């Protein structure tokens, strides 16, 4: 048979290692001539593995790059002026590595250049919450000092956003063993831990979805007018840059001012974590300076798009992507996603080449600049939007296949639960003392979801990853999936070697997965959900799962605004119409089930009832989008206003009552919070009579 | 057979006599009970008919009444103080309806309240141009004066907006005998003239698509939240009040200052056409004075839905509606139109009756506060943007089916030029002298079009009525047909009784239609398009039709821009980019009309290609909207920045070229014009792209 056993049973472990491998001798940053030629080679495999087409699709957008002959670095200067401690000008090379040329120094991709001197301040991790007690409580200010931060938590834009805002200068960011230094477990090369000389690398932007800051809304394409820099979206106004530990050491000893608050504050250097601002004493009129270069610079950038025709519907899309761009060597991000994707299109074009299609038409997508802002998927989705709008049935992520090696994860729409509930009930778990098990079981007892008991964690969607566009702009019903570690001991600062030179292929053979057993596990999943996605006959979403859901939302943000018991009598403040709209949402898609289920086995009933089940994600979409963030355009799920990693559930009512007991209009925050539960139960009830009878 | 002769047979001139009778024997002014009575009643009748569901839609809307104890009026004012002459307080009623209770008197709907003095100035038809010719040419200034402009031209909101910015405190609209007095043709009662009595009422918002004032973007349901009077949108900020010629002479008689200065200025009436400030010598020290106390009032509204179900497509919908308010007895304004799709809506209804139903879903509407601001329509459609975005297939209007008795006026997407040339041809003429001749052959020869000789003129979609949210912010392919006059003799002025009480059963009967058999003729093109559009088993669209036509507007938008070779040179501004992407177009349509003519006669892809026609007029949508204009979201076509009633093509580049030599940056103002190049050629592409091959 041509089903999904067999799909799934000629996809091979060792095939996924041999593709890291290949995928992983030399760097691959966005906009080099490396990752063109990256680019080709990937453009060549699929069309020999059988894909009807292989095409790239190139953009010029707007890149950051280091100056090769002006390093960045940061100093401590004293009265004369003299740099007395100067920080690393790149991370020492692992072994094997020391003679590959082409390795881009840490820096904060689009910092503007600067040479900023001045007091520090500590932050922690830079948090909203960060520094509201720091201004509200300890009345500390920052304006004009330099602050520095903790990676952590949060997204990194979201701290440079926050310390900008709070008046500084300027922004240094490191690495704390605290939240990078797992116990017990040694340095690279030797565990999987950060060594003190290793440094995060990632952009420091705020674009809220718009893709090149210099073209939202449409395709960077040979015509494109542009903005000017100074009308660029989500470009940071001060100067930034990452260190790692041992150079963080050296700039914290030395602090005074006030203590840290609490312990929550202190990381695990042996330092006070004193808040500042300025030294102690001694050291009083010693001050920081940083010395970033950087240039932005319009640069090409290319995807790699693959397409393998439906036979039924090929005017419907199953989509498949990850990007292939690394910041070095991309050992886990993203190669360890990207080889699961070579493999699981290998497997299909198998099937292909012995004359099976799928029902609906798969895209697989390399795509380009995901580390400089979601940029290759963002361009080429403005290029295509009306194709997706209205073909567009599901979009399957495959960045890193492993963040670690104890269970599962999975984040996607709730139409996605059934499908993969029933999906890792088919297959067999990897897990030691789970032998002969499924997936599913393993999943569920290592992973419990915080609701349900007998049913396994999955997460909403956030962002930081290039579903953003497909998800939040377009409506199109997305997921992930990858190996994770223990939720109990999750810090949420990521890995200890991410966006690190050290993250390589020997730390993944070595260290996460020797057998290539997880990675086989994600492309099982990730592979077996665009299988059924693209041939089940009945699209296999369950929108019960979404009433389900969006009554647990009504619950929580009901909860929030209850907080102020006083002014929702005042302003008179009902979640009434929310709850209705849930409710008739539940009923509504209860009716709809049992359609599904009795209709008459009538393909135009059934096409029909299918573009019900598409249309029902797209049905959420709000075209003026939410306030000041016209890209993210989804009512239900953005991102995180404090932090774009972390979806946030009703954002409109969300940043409405946040922090509301501070407005000086509490008449004007009130209606806002009125208008955004009016504009929520009404796309509710518009979501929902979708799914009623058509006429 | 149950075939369009069938329908087309059953459509009687007698019957669309007895319902114009009927729904014109007293007023039906939006937001009253009689016009609540009205819609119950069309709803009764509908079901009677055979529909399978009709519905009353209903939202609460800003309207706009006069205080019927505290009278609207102008006065010329003494030195005093004393009011020594008065305009009227009512239009005099025609004969027979002297008694008739709750005829609305003469005003302009949404005018604040207020009662400035002083100085007139006479603009002409206070369009941008006279405004220019006022300011720039004459040096005369309008600031704090109030001016009086005839009718004519443009539509009333534009002559208040452009007045506003002018500095105005207060605007007065009449209709000159020049723009409403026909040669040779007596006053109603005696023919279809305006007395000296006579008045047009009409709203004065600027709206821009927007529907309700007080919930832009969102149905005004139960539990809307509406924005304050102060952060509505569209109202004017002067107040605003329409007269007849017998009172404008009165307040025109004494002006002084300038001289008009050229003739194109210059009226019918016995008066010098000064423009001002003031009155001549003796009467220096006369003024004008308004009184305005009509008020804004939240009020509930009404819309008719019926729903006639496909019997293959029901979850495709061709929707047929036009408005059911009226300003008095709507004897051409609605009611014409309504008697009209009511005919239809019983014919479709015997057919049913019979056993047939048509391939696609029918759906008829007769909306509410039309004369408002589209506000029925546009709530509705707010309110099912999402069923309507992915399941509407076209919408024709059905507003007034007569403005004269001289020959055929279509006005559509280009996607519908086919359709209507092969409907035409299959219909009988009802013009005297072509007794025997199809209305294509009469048509053709009283309105040649200015491109093609041999055929017949069909006009852009303008705006000021009920499809402009189903077009130009929605992107469902719209149409409408209607008799009309001459256009050698067009003056754009519309027709003499316009939104006056004189408007009447017996204008209908005695003047413009005696047989019913222009009407009969609107009825077989009305109601012959939606039956070819819901039952055609391929939708009866030709993209190449669009192709031709984008590029008549290419051509067209480069012939303004080269007004200005030494900016072009300059700023380096090229059209290449539009060229390029229209020619792909006409490539792409044509390869598209290949495929749907050879392809295999299956039904998805038959079901495939009729989503690529459907989707064809959705892909000229802009999420982003035009400048300032949000709700106007078709790139090809807008409502005119000065006149709403007129379309202008690729309307972004035009606003962007328009007056372009003030403009004081002129290095921003041709970005400006180069960024509206880069979204027009994008989106063409874009458009074309769609009808591909899909995979
Ligand atoms: C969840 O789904 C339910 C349906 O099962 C929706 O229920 C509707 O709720 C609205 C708001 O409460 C009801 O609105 C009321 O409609 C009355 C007239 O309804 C009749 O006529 C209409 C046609 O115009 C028919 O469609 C309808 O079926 C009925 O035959 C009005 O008279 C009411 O207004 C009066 O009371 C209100 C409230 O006190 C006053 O403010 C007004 O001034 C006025 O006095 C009112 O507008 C509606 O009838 C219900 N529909 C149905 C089919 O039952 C919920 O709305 C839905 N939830 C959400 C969030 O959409
Ligand atoms: C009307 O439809 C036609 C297609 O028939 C479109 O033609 C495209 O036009 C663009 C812009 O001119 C061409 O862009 C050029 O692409 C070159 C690479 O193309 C090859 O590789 C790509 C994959 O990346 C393939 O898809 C493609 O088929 C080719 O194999 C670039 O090298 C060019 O850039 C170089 O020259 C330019 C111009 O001087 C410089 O600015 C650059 O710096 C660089 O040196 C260029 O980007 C494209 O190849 C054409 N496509 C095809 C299929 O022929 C029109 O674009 C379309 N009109 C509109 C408005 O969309
Ligand atoms: C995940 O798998 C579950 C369990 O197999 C699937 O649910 C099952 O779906 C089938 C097929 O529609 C249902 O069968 C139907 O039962 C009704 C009940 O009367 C009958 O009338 C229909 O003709 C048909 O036989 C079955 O009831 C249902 N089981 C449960 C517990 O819900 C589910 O659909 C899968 N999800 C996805 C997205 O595929
Ligand atoms: C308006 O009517 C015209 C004239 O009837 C329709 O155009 C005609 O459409 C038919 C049906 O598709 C075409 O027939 C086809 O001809 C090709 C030519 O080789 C053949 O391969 C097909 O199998 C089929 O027989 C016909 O050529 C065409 N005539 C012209 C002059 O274009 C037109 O489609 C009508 N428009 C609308 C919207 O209905
Ligand atoms: C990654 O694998 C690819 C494909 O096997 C290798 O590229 C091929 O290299 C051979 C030998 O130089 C050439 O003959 C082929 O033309 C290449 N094929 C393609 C499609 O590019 C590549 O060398 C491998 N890279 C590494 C570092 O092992
Ligand atoms: C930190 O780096 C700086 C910059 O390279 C060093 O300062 C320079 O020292 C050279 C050689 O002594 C002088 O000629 C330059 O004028 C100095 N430049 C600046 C900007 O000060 C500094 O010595 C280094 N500090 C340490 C502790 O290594
Ligand atoms: C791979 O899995 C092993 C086994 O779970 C992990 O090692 C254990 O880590 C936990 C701490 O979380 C300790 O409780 C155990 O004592 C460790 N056992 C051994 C044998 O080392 C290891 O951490 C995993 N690798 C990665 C990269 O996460
Ligand atoms: C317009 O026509 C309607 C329908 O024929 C008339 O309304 C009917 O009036 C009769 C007599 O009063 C009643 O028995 C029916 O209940 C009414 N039907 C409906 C559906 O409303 C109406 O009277 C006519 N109006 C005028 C001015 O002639
Ligand atoms: C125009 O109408 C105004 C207002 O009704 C008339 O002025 C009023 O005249 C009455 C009776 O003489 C006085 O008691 C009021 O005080 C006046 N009101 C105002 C506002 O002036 C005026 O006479 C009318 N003018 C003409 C020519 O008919
Ligand atoms: C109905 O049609 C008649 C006949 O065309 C119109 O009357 C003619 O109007 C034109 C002026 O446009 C004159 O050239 C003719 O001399 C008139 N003839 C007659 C017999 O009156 C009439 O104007 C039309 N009615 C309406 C409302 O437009
Ligand atoms: C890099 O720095 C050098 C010298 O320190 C300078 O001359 C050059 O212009 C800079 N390059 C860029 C791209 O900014
Ligand atoms: C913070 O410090 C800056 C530095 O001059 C000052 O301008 C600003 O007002 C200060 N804010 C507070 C709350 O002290
Ligand atoms: C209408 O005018 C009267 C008296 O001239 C005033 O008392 C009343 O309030 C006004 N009505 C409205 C609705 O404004
Ligand atoms: C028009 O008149 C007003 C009235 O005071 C004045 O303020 C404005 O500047 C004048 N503009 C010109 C161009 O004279
Ligand atoms: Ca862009
Ligand atoms: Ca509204
Ligand atoms: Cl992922
Ligand atoms: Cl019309
Ligand atoms: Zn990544
Ligand atoms: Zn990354
Ligand atoms: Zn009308
Ligand atoms: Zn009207």
Known sequence: KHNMKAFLDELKAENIKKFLYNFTQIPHLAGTEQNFQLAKQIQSQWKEFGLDSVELAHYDVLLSYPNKTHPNYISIINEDGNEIFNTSLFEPPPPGYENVSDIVPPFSAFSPQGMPEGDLVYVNYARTEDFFKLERD??????????????????????????????????????????????????????????????????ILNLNGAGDPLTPGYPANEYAYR????????????????????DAQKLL?????????????????????????????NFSTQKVKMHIHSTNEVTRIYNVIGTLRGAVEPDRYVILGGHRDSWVFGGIDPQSGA???????????????????????????????????????????????????????????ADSSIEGNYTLRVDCTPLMYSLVHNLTKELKSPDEGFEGKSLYESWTKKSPSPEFSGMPRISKLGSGNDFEVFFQRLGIASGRARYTKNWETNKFSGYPLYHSVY?????????????????????????????????????????????????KYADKIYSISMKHPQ???????????????????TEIASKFSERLQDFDKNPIVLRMMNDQLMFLERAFIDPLGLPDRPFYR?????????????????????????????????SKAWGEVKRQIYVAAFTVQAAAETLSEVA
């Not at 903005?227 to 041992?246: D, F, K, N, T, W």
């Not at 074009?349 to 979601?374: C, H, N, Q």
């Not at 005042?570 to 709850?579: A, E, G, K, P, R």
């Open 503 to 551: 993250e390589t292929y020997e730390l993944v053979e070595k260290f996460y997965d020797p057998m290539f057993k997880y990675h086989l596990t994600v492309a099982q999943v990730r592979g077996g959900m665009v299988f059924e996605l693209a041939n089940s006959i009945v699209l296999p979403f369950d929108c019960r799962d979404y009433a389900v859901v969006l009554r």
């Open 634 to 666: 989804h009512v239900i799920y953005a991102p995180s206003s404090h932090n774009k990693y972390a979806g946030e559930s009703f954002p409109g009512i969300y940043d409405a009552l946040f922090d509301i007991e501070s407005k000086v209009d509490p």
């Open 138 to 203: 300890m009345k500390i200010n920052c304006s004009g000092k330099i602050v520095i931060a903790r990676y952590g938590k949060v997204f990194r834009g979201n701290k440079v956003k926050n310390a900008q805002l709070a008046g500084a200068k300027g922004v240094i960011l490191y690495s704390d063993p605290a939240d990078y230094f797992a116990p017990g477990v040694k340095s690279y090369p030797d565990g999987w831990n950060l060594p003190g000389g290793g440094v995060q690398r990632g952009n």
């Open 339 to 397: 080889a699961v994707v070579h493999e699981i299109v290998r497997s299909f074009g198998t099937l292909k080449k012995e004359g099976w299609r799928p029902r609906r038409t798969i895209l697989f997508a390399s795509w380009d600049a995901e580390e400089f802002g979601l940029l290759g998927s963002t361009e080429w989705a403005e290029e295509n939007s009306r194709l997706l709008q209205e073909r567009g049935v599901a979009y399957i992520n």
């Open 253 to 281: 000893e030395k602090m005074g001012g006030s203590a840290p608050p609490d312990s929550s504050w202190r990381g695990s250097l042996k330092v006070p974590y004193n808040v500042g601002p300025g030294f102690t004493g």
């Open 227 to 246: 903005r000017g820099i100074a009308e660029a979206v989500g470009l940071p106004s001060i100067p930034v840059h990452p260190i790692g530990y041992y």
């Open 567 to 585: 002014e929702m009598k005042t302003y008179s403040v009902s979640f009434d119409s929310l709850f209705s709209a849930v409710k008739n949402f």
